[PDB]
Amino acid sequence: SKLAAEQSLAQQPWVEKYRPKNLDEVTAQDHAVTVLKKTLKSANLPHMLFYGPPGTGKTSTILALTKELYGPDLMKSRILELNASDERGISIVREKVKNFARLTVSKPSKHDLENYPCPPYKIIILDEADSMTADAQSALRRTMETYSGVTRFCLICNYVTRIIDPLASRCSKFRFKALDASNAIDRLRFISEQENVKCDDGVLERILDISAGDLRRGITLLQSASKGAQYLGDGKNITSTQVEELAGVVPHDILIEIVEKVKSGDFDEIKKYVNTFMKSGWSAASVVNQLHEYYITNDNFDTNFKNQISWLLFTTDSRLNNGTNEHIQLLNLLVKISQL
Amino acid sequence: SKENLPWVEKYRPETLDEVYGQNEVITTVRKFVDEGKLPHLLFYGPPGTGKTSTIVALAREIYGKNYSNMVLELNASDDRGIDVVRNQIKDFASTRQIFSKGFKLIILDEADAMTNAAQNALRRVIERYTKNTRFCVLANYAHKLTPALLSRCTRFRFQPLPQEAIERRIANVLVHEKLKLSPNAEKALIELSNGDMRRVLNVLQSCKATLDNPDEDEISDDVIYECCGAPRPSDLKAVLKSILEDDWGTAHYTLNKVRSAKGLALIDLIEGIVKILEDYELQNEETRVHLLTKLADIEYSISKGGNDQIQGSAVIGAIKASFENET
Amino acid sequence: INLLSTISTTTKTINHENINEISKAWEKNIALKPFDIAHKMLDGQIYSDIGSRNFTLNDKIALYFDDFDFTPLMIQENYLSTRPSVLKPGQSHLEAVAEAANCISLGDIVEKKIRSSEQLWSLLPLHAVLSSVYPASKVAGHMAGRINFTAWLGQNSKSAKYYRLLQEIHYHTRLGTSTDKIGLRLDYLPTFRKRLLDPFLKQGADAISSVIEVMDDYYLTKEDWDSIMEFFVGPDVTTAIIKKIPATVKSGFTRKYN
Amino acid sequence: MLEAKFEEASLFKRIIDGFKDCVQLVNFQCKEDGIIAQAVDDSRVLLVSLEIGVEAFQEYRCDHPVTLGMDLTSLSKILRCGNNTDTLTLIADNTPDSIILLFEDTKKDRIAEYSLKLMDIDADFLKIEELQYDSTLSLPSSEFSKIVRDLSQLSDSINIMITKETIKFVADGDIGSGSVIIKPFVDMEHPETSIKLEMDQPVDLTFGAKYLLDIIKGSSLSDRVGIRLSSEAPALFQFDLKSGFLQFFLAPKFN
Amino acid sequence: TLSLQLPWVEKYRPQVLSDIVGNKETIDRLQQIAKDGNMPHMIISGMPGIGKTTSVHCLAHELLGRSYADGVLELNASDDRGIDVVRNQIKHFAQKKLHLPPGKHKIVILDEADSMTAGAQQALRRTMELYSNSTRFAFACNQSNKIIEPLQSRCAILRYSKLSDEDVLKRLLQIIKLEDVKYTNDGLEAIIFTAEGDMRQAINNLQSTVAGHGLVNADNVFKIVDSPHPLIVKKMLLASNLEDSIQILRTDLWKKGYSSIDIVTTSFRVTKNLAQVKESVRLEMIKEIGLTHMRILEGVGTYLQLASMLAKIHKLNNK
Amino acid sequence: WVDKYRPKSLNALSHNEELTNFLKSLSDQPRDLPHLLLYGPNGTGKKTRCMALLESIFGPGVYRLKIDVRQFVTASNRKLELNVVSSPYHLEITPSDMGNNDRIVIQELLKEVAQMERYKCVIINEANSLTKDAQAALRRTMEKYSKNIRLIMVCDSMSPIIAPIKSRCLLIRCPAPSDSEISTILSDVVTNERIQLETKDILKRIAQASNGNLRVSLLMLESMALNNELALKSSSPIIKPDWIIVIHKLTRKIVKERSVNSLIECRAVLYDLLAHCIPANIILKELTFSLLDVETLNTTNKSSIIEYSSVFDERLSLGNKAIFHLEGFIAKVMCCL
DNA sequence: GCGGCATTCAAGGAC
DNA sequence: TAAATACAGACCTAAGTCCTTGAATGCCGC
């Protein structure tokens, strides 16, 4: 039972092993968990709409809230979780969701009332609402306003724009903030100490810097670094360079060579260097991000140069987001900023 | 108990006197239902402007406390089909009332979703059974309604609620709850609303939960901003000022520190900057063209993801390049 | 006959004086065939000032909407085969065709966004102008040759059949390739042809055993062997190479397979 | 804690089959005096009011009033799971949730335990109609069902006319017309065949055919049905049960 | 309140062919057909609220006299568009025996005929062919293209057009005279202007204005009935400077609650029907509005996208 | 000889020693293992590395695999057929063999192996072809069942992969082998296969003709052995795949004559290439890269060509009709020249 | 044991 | 053998729901 669950958590990846179980474990999203904790003493949960960058902890936050509200017994009876892996067309929204909302809340047992608030409403979580079609969203719209007495709707999404405006109007919007170094260094340090991860001074902060507001990717990075250090058995500390090597970060010397090739060199040499560079299989997004950081941070280029380099990097990133060939886009970027 | 419902549903108007914002529509509707000439209504308006609430209050005033039985309310969550029209709407219009004597009412809430075939079948039902029942169509969008159905109903364009009415509604809420609001906090609340009372009620309850105290304190602009995550106006002008005259390195550092100190979103700052520069007096239009085009493309790219720092530097560069034409 | 019966009740005499209102109120508004739609859309007179005043843009969108499933296909097929008459001063045919193809790409993007999830069918008017009206306007003029029917359907069907055949081949050979469908098509096949077909050309009928062994090593079949030779193009087309092979070798190979 | 024990398990099934097509969701109000239920059609054209007293139940125990919101399309299947010679037991806890139906055989030993999840119908159902009608008639249920199903084929509207000792059903459609005329007669040799009529003012008004076909589906409960009409008032179709009754308040068409 | 009174659309609905102020030629043709008899198969097409259903109803009434109840089969085609309906009910009515005067026929009215399914539309052809000597068909639709070509082959075609301002004004003045309503010339001009040739809409607006304010004056009409939405958009695109277009978009459209999708659809429709600018400019403007509409339909709909639309149109107009 | 001489374990790998050490570190504790995403250039051998990692995590019986057939029903009641590679310890799924019905085969079947089950590995081959709906469906499925199902997704480019999918799995890059390492593998192959080389440098040249690809290198060597009869001389011609010569002829036609009459011929060539099981993205990449190699053009032309190729690559990724964008790209290239 | 009717579902079409 | 005009080349697939519609399934009534 409990021992089996603790063993299973101990033999699971750190992403799920240290998934928050209570509202106190949510570190940086204080403005949302404060309201979620205050509404626990009361029973006036509104319809909620969680939105933000991936890996900020919306699913973990809602799971912890539902646990704290219902207990491990009623968690399986008063919760309807529909993911992006399930059919959510018009027929599904009209049949299953509406029938569940129309049903009365399950009667809690004697043990639930003594330890948990046990609100008289149930929660339907709808994860990844971006994929839901707008007409199904209108069905949800009119489902969420008449049966609000016994059911509470919580949409979770990555892009708020994919949901129609009235649906965002009926639900209280909760923005999950990007988890950079400042607000997630405590969580990363706690995770590292819980696994006896002996690292250097600026490793965890560097991990969150490469994460770019994503604690899941940072946790996976720390896990991979820990396994890599444990395999060696040398007993030393994980270094920042070792972190960025397996994180897909281009080394500084390669980036410098790219800068020299763009600065001095014609189209042929630049094309040859791009052809050689794509052999190493670097991710295009990381290369564009590193070029952006180097060009914006370095105070040797003129402001008119800065405007155009920023616009070209933005255009290339937008093109690369929509499933394009990395080599062609990177070559176009290098050539266009070479003529500058 | 009503204390269990959220503020968005707790404070739903029950009578026509609690529906604020709309005055030219409410008095006309009251005169229509008092003198007896109630034609087929079409409430077209943005979300949260109070169409469903006012139609429910009208039906309650017309029929009494037993509204839930003498009025046929069809909505988008229903089947919205053509067969459902043919059976249910035709039977309800043709038959008489089971509880009292009088005309019947059909509220087709969110009828923009209604299929073209359903509206085609309905446009004859409304015209034929017009002596003993009335039709009310509520719509956020009017293009989804066929012109033939559009021309059979008297159109009422619900406008976003102005300052005074929404301020009065927040005053009523602060009367009902042991709560107080700062004047500047209330002004920021109104500014961040865009004529949506649903947003106001939701964020008001959220900040009430945020207060962390038994409510002997006041809700200031800080509480509102840290609860709803909107940028402060001060930070908005600070970011724009650093972009405008300060150095690229200093401007980038200022934007990063403002956006990371309180975890702000790039889209919120972008919208605030667009609103702020809309009052800027510019001699030529080319700079405005470049600003609008680049900012709209950046917003569209943000709406699909990507690199956040690249997007912020793109905003900075777009603003600087657009205003480089103002020499 | 119906028009004569209906109109003679009021006007006992019909003359050349009133014929304009007779014809204007009894016009046959029938959907034109896709060939006539392509002919009308690619007419250079229509996009002139007089033509624009007479045949307005709404009529162009209606002509597209008469058959919206084939109009973009025909327009893309036969827009670069018309002699232009609306070229701007300083613009050649190649530039106009390039702009038309750019608008064709935009129209295809719109069509994909329409015929995919979220059912953005209200964008149909947009697809009216991006796929058909604008590209035709760019290259409007006279018809040089004949209006060929769109060949994209036939090439699509042929590509789908070839993709199905490649799927069968790859799922047969997965036990040895451990390579994806495209990876086996691009690289494995130029070697498979040389392993199977070249020994027949260079050694005669004594290389049947080696080819059979090679094909059984990868679980290849007679139908699979026939389908393999149909994938190569360009300087390596086997449609005549197999016929050059002596019939005795083919008969022996078929007997060995049997 | 609600605990009801029926005499025969098929009596509840016969009650529910009356509501099967004209009603989707019901709110059973359970009190010390019996079970009450009121429902409105999806088109809101007819109203169903059922009352079954404590007499029909072999055993009854209702500690506090209970509200049981339930769907008929599932309860019909659940009752169809019983037998002709079974007995039915309704169980509900202190908090209304997941009503339990127990089928027990009296000839043998068998336990059939079924569950039904309750649903929250926000609209309350407690209204009572008490008004004098212009005409009150009583006729065998089988005969009235026969006339309704016979005249439903001609058209979708059936007109009922009550005149001095004359009862008229008129159905005028596209394939023709039809008229059934009856007189109130007293049958001493069998009392359940006679037709009674007490009229205060002539009545003439029209109903829809399909709703009449849905109401006459309740003829399996009682052998005689009462029909009460009034001007500008709903029509009362009443099947009298042993412990209570079932009444359809059906609304006429506008002229 | 206990009851309502009949709307002026129904109360003053014409019952004779002379009371209709529509197209004079077709109305006179219908009067002559009713006077002489032998009504042929017909389809009446046009825009909403110009007197299509009313014309056919009065024609059938005048043609059949007291036999309208048993000689007229009026069905909303959108209500009954099944092929089974044509196979059974329409067929039975067509074969039904009825002793009629020697110049009158049974009339089948198919209201909203443009919504009939393909199967019923094809099945109706032989039904109207085999019983063409005792059963006549009158279709009422808004788009003739939705009716199959063979169906149009067997019938007269009556294209109704938009009502002229004079006819609408005359009908309105007759209604005021029959209702004793205080009015003003500017108010009636505003009613006609916002009617856009739809007599039903004009009548409804007049009745609503009378019931809400009592006096038909231009101020009241523009207060209760907004000016035509496409005209503000048309003024918005045709602005000479970007500042003016942004001002109209902000004040008249965005601050008044008009949704972004409505604005982009209206701009698309206006530019499609525009005639002031050249063809190439119109196509390029439609390209830009369509791109912005594509952006809006993904849920990106804000004021910034519409501002970009106007800025890019003004760049296009800037040579 | 693509499968005759192929490593079967981590100790049998012969290039990217750091990558092999990273795989060994990840396989030291196989129970505490996150989801994996192997990305890199096509033909590097990342599938071989994932197979070796599986053979390290489980017993040597991983390579003993079988092909089964599964039938699924979509929303249109169609009978979609999927051939699935299964092993007593792992299974492989390639959703790239169908159209927009990938999400279906993503959602149901994985649940079937997620609800039936210390873990069973799932290998998603060619995750680039996964539609965004399929990736969204996989998004929560990867997290809900992490104690029974672990994903190992192989792709050549993470550009079409959405951000949540990237964050939910560890990322491993597989750089293309260096020319010296490729030459070493070629020398081992020709020594074991008894191939006669008068000079070793020939092998090196094959590497410079492979652009880092190992699959292409070995298959080109096999193509070379049959023309020269198992003995390679100093001037053995380089055998290119037929589509490469077709594309090269297309570039020659583009750079030689620029008109709509030649545009029709280019349309015919593109249709012929597309009808024979060849992706449009690869066609565009090879066409642009051969256009860039033309010495007649200057930097002004090449910059415009690469800009158009990127723009039309975006169009093709946002489009469905390949010719509709390839024709536009070639037309703009003709306009530039 | 059929006879009849009602219900449901799958195939094609439309946007 | 030419005028003179009609007029035919050709039909796509995944996808989303709604709608129709034939036909099979299912049940009750007799």
Next chain:
DNA sequence: CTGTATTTA
């Protein structure tokens, strides 16, 4: 439009 089938010159 090109190309072909049909009717009339």
